[PDB]
Design a protein around this ligand. Sequence first.
Ligand SMILES: CC(C)[C@H](Nc1ncnc(N)c1Cl)c1ccc2c(c1)S(=O)(=O)CCC2
Length: 167
Amino acid sequence: NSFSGYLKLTDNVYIKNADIVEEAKKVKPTVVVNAANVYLKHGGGVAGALNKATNNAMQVESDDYIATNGPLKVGGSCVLSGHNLAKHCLHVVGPNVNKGEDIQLLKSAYENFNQHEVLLAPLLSAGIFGADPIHSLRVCVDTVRTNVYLAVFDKNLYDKLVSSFLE
Ligand SMILES: CC(C)[C@H](Nc1ncnc(N)c1Cl)c1ccc2c(c1)S(=O)(=O)CCC2
């Protein structure tokens, strides 16, 4: 958990302009969070980047989990191996508002982070999931009580999030 160069926003929420994959390699965190979908198909974006960094081992393990347990619910999670990136990967499904899922489930999604003391995570439901990223940060700050290190891979978005939170 050797996180470096983060800006502390609250007593338990930190943020950095960084690729979550690059952070996982440098930090070797106990838990890395994946911004998953309910069938754990890691086809692009954050999930695709994390899966590619495990040389597809995450996707094979995920298919085996789904075969035995069925899909997740929106707002839910599962703990699987972290492979070479972390001890564990916490796969969390935030709502995809571009597909009509309820934005209120973003609170349920962040609540899954409270079962782990320290996490490296992405900004849930941002990007192509369509949630307002400033709203996602506010729900993270209001809901997560354990120590969360957010990696946002876009300097422009990083700067807007820090400005909107320090207002
Ligand atoms: C807002 C983006 C800059 C951010 N991207 C990243 N943030 C950190 N490490 C990365 N490798 C990337 Cl790709 C982001 C955060 C959340 C989500 C996505 C994108 S998505 O479009 O893959 C859909 C699922 C939710």
